[PDB]
C-alpha cells in the first residue's frame, strides 16, 4: 500500500509575542514544497519543546536549524521516528544510529538515535537511502557474446592440474587453494609474462611500476570496495606490539605443547588494517591521489606484476583454475574518455593476435557485469554503455561438450570512478577516465594446458619457440 514517509522529532533548546512567528512558520518559513504544499506542518508543542514533523521535503533536522535562526531574536534530541513504506516485511538488521526496527502491516518503522552533531552531519539521510535500497532490492550476473572463434579439435581431454600433479609440474601448498610451482609450471608462467610484455605491453608503450600488495582501508574506501568486498578478503592484522615480553606466552606455549595457540594470538593482534591484494589496481591509485596531471602526460599507461592476489573463494577441491592465491599482471590506463576507449581497443587487438597466433587457442569475448560492481555487492550492468567489463573465455575440453568456459582475463572501462574516488584531476579540467586489464596466469595455464597438453611436441611452434628447452622437475622416490 502507498504509505507515506514520515519524519518525527521531539526536541528542546518569558515571551508571548512568539505567536506571530510559530503560527506563520508553518505556512511561510517551512512551506518549500516541490510538487505541491509539501512542507512541514500539523503537530503539537530554555526548554522549548518541539514535536514538528515532515516528509522527504524540508526534513525535520533541516527545519530544526531553521528555527535556530528565527528564535535567535545546542539542540537536545528526545524522540526520533521514521516510518518507511515497504510493500512487504524485511529481516531484522543492526545499523548504526538505529535503536529500533519493526516490520508491520504497513511497512517498516525505524527509531533513529541522533544528537545535533549527528543531525548536522546528515545521518538520517544515509540511513534512509540504505534502508530504501534494501527495500528496492526486496538477481543474476549479466552475460552476452561479442565474438567466438570457430570450433577446434581437442585431442587433449585430461584435467591439466591432474596432469601437472602426476608429472611433477606442481604441488599443493599448505594454505587453502594454494599451489607451489615446480620448475616446469614456473617456466609456463614466465613465458606467458614474456608474451604479455613483448607482444602487448612494450609495443603499446606501457611502463612498469610496482604497486603495494598490502591494501589498507583508506584505499578500499576510495575505490568503493569498502562497500561490500568483505566476504572474500584475507584480512591482515599487525601485532599489537613488537615487545618480545608480550609474545613470550605464545612462544612458550608452542615450545611445550607443539601447538600454536591461535585463540590467544587472535587476542594479541590488532584489529585488521585492511587485507591482502584483491583487485591489485586500487593501491596504485595512491600514487596519483590528489594530483593534477598535465595534459601532455596522458594517457598514463602502466602495469604491475610484483606479487600475489588473495581471495577467499568458495569451498571445494579445485585445480589451478580456481585458487585462493594467484598471480596476475594488472594493466592500468588513465586519460580522457576517448583515450581510455582507444587504449582498450589497442589491447583487444594485441590479445587477439596472442590467442590466435601464439597460443592458438579456442576462445571468446563477452560483455559481463563490471568487475567493480560485482566486487562491492552489485550486479547487472553499468549506467553508461561505454563503461563495463569484457571477459575472455576459453573451453576446457575435460569439462565435456557442455562444460562451462573459463574466464581467463578481462578488459574494463571504469569511467570516472577511480579518478573521482582518489581525486585525480586533469590540468585542462576535462573529465579523467580509467581502464584496467587483469591477466590471470593460473587461468592462462589452465586454458593452454587443457587445450594443448603438457607435451612440448604438441604445442604451437610460436609458443614452443618462446619457451626454450623445458626444465626438468624435482623427482622423488
Ligand X SMILES: Nc1ncnc2c1ncn2[C@@H]1O[C@H](COS(=O)(=O)NC(=O)[C@@H](N)CO)[C@@H](O)[C@H]1O
Neighbour tally for 385: CB within 10 Å: 9
Task: Decide if 443 is catalytic.
Answer: yes
Residue closer to a second copy by CB (options 26, 306) is: 306
If binding is defined by CB under 8 A, does position 25 make contact with a second copy? no
- The piece of 214-222, 322-330, 380-388, 406-414 that touches Cl ion (CB under 5 A) is 214-222
Task: Decide if 321 is catalytic.
Answer: no
Residue closer to a second copy by CB (options 13, 189) is: 189
Task: Compute the least distance from the CB of residue 291 to a second copy, in Å.
Answer: 4
Say if residues 438 and 413 touch (Cβ distance below 8 Å): no
R_g of the chain computed on alpha carbons: 29
Pick from 80, 278, 333, 372 the residue near Cl ion by CB under 5 A.
Answer: 278
If binding is defined by CB under 5 A, does position 219 make contact with Zn ion? no
If binding is defined by CB under 5 A, does position 285 make contact with Cl ion? no
How many whole angstroms separate alpha carbon 133 and alpha carbon 131?
5
Residue closer to ligand X by CB (options 360, 442) is: 442
Q: Which of 360, 410, 414, 442 is catalytic?
A: 410
19 labelled ligand-binding: no
Q: Which of 304, 321, 324, 330 is catalytic?
A: 330
Pick from 292, 350, 352, 416 the residue near a second copy by CB under 8 A.
Answer: 292
Inter-CA distances, 158 with 154, 238, 396, 399, Å: 10, 43, 9, 9
Residue closer to ligand X by CB (options 365, 443) is: 443
Pick from 84, 110, 279, 298 the residue near ligand X by CB under 6 A.
Answer: 279
Task: Compute the least distance from the CB of residue 184 to ligand X, in Å.
Answer: 19
Strand, helix or coil at 312? Answer: coil
If binding is defined by CB under 5 A, does position 279 make contact with Cl ion? yes
What residues between 383 and 422 interact with a second copy by CB under 8 A?
none
Q: Which of 391, 395, 414, 442 is catalytic?
A: 391
If binding is defined by CB under 5 A, does position 436 make contact with Zn ion? yes
Pick from 30, 52, 229, 281 the residue near ligand X by CB under 6 A.
Answer: 281
- The piece of 43-51, 54-62, 94-102, 360-368 that touches a second copy (CB under 8 A) is 94-102
229 labelled ligand-binding: no
How many whole angstroms separate alpha carbon 117 and alpha carbon 120?
5
What residues between 103 and 142 interact with a second copy by CB under 8 A?
123, 126-127, 129-130
Which set of grid coordinates corresponds to residue 15? 515571551
What residues between 322 and 361 interact with ligand X by CB under 6 A?
322-323, 326, 328, 330
Pick from 159, 339, 362, 407 the residue near ligand X by CB under 6 A.
Answer: 407
Q: Which of 370, 380, 299, 371 is nearest to 341 (CA)?
A: 299
How many whole angstroms separate alpha carbon 471 and alpha carbon 392?
30
DSSP string, 337-386: HHHHHHHHHHHHHHHHHIIIIIS---EEEEEES-HHHHHTT--S--SSSS
Task: Decide if 281 is catalytic.
Answer: yes
Neighbour tally for 50: CB within 10 Å: 20
Task: Decide if 304 is catalytic.
Answer: no
How many whole angstroms separate alpha carbon 96 and alpha carbon 123?
10
Q: Which long-range contacts (CB under 8 A, 24 or more apart) does 96-101 make?
A: 97/123, 97/124, 97/127, 98/127
Pick from 60, 164, 215, 340 the residue near Cl ion by CB under 5 A.
Answer: 215
Residue closer to ligand X by CB (options 80, 372) is: 372
Inter-CA distances, 247 with 8, 254, 258, 266, Å: 53, 11, 16, 12
Task: Decide if 436 is catalytic.
Answer: yes
Kindly tell me the burial class for residue 27, based on how many C-beta atoms sit within 10 Å of its own C-beta (0-12, 13-18, 19 or more): exposed
DSSP string, 5-24: -EEEEEEE----TTHHHHTT
Task: Decide if 259 is catalytic.
Answer: no
Inter-CA distances, 443 with 320, 321, 382, 448, Å: 7, 5, 26, 9
Residue with cell 585462493: 324
Task: Decide if 391 is catalytic.
Answer: yes
Inter-CA distances, 328 with 149, 175, 204, 308, Å: 25, 19, 19, 7
312 labelled ligand-binding: yes
Question: Among all residues, which ones are annotated catalytic?
Answer: 281, 311, 313, 322, 330, 391, 407, 410, 436, 443
Annotated binding site for ATP: 311-313, 322-323, 407, 443
Binding site for ligand X (CB under 6 A): 279-281, 311, 313, 322-323, 326, 328, 330, 371, 407-410, 436, 438, 440, 442-443
Amino acid at each position: 500500500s502507498h504509505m507515506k514517509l514520515q519524519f518525527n522529532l521531539k526536541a528542546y533548546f518569558a515571551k508571548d509575542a512568539i505567536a506571530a512567528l510559530f503560527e506563520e512558520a508553518n505556512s511561510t518559513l517551512l512551506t518549500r514544497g516541490a510538487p505541491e504544499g509539501q512542507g512541514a506542518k500539523v503537530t503539537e508543542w530554555d526548554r522549548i519543546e518541539l514535536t514538528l514533523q515532515s516528509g522527504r521535503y524540508v526534513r525535520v533536522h533541516d527545519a530544526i536549524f531553521r528555527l535556530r535562526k528565527q528564535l535567535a531574536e545546542g539542540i537536545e534530541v528526545e524522540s526520533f521516528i521514521i516510518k518507511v513504506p515497504a510493500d512487504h516485511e524485511l529481516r531484522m538488521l543492526k545499523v548504526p544510529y538505529i535503536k529500533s526496527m519493526e516490520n508491520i502491516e504497513g511497512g517498516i518503522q525505524l527509531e533513529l538515535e541522533v544528537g545535533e552533531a549527528e543531525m548536522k552531519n546528515r545521518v538520517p539521510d544515509r540511513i534512509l537511502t540504505l534502508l530504501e535500497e534494501k527495500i528496492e532490492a526486496a538477481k543474476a550476473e549479466h552475460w552476452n557474446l561479442l565474438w567466438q572463434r570457430e570450433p577446434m579439435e581437442h585431442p587433449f581431454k585430461e584435467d591439466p592440474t591432474q596432469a601437472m600433479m602426476k608429472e611433477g609440474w606442481l604441488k599443493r601448498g599448505s594454505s587453502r587453494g594454494q599451489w607451489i610451482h615446480g620448475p616446469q609450471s614456473a617456466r609456463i608462467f614466465r613465458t606467458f609474462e614474456k608474451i604479455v610484455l613483448e607482444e602487448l605491453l612494450e609495443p603499446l608503450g606501457y611502463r612498469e611500476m610496482i604497486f603495494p600488495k598490502l591494501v589498507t582501508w583508506e584505499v578500499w574506501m576510495k575505490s568503493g570496495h569498502a562497500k561490500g568486498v568483505y566476504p572474500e578478503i584475507y584480512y591482515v592484522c599487525p601485532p599489537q606490539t613488537r615487545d618480545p615480553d608480550y609474545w613470550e606466552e605464545v612462544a612458550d606455549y608452542y615450545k611445550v605443547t607443539h601447538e600454536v595457540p591461535t585463540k590467544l594470538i587472535k587476542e594479541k593482534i590488532a584489529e585488521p588494517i585492511g587485507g591482502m591484494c584483491y583487485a591489485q589496481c586500487p593501491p596504485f591509485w595512491m600514487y596519483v591521489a590528489g594530483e593534477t596531471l598535465p595534459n601532455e602526460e596522458i594517457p598514463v599507461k602502466v602495469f604491475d606484476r610484483s606479487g600475489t592476489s588473495h581471495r577467499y573463494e568458495s569451498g571445494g577441491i579445485h585445480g589451478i583454475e580456481r585458487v585462493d592465491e594467484f598471480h596476475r599482471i594488472e594493466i592500468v590506463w588513465i586519460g580522457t574518455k576517448e583515450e581510455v576507449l582507444k587504449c582498450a581497443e589497442e589491447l583487444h587487438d594485441r590479445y587477439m593476435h596472442i590467442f590466435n597466433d601464439i597460443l592458438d587457442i579456442e576462445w571468446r569475448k563477452a560483455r559481463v557485469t563490471p568487475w567493480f560492481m560485482a566486487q562491492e555487492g552489485l550486479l547487472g550492468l553499468a549506467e553508461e554503455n561505454t563503461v563495463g567489463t569484457t571477459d575472455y573465455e576459453a573451453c576446457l575440453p575435460y569439462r565435456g561438450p557442455d562444460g562451462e568456459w573459463l574466464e581467463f582475463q578481462n578488459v574494463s572501462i571504469n569511467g570516472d570512478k577511480y579518478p573521482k574516488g582518489f581525486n585525480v584531476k586533469l590540468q585542462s579540467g576535462d573529465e579523467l577516465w580509467s581502464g584496467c586489464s587483469g591477466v590471470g596466469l593460473e587461468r592462462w595455464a589452465a586454458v593452454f594446458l587443457a587445450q594443448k597438453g603438457l607435451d612440448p611436441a604438441n604445442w604451437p611452434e610460436e609458443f614452443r619457440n618462446r619457451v626454450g628447452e623445458m626444465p626438468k622437475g624435482i623427482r622423488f622416490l
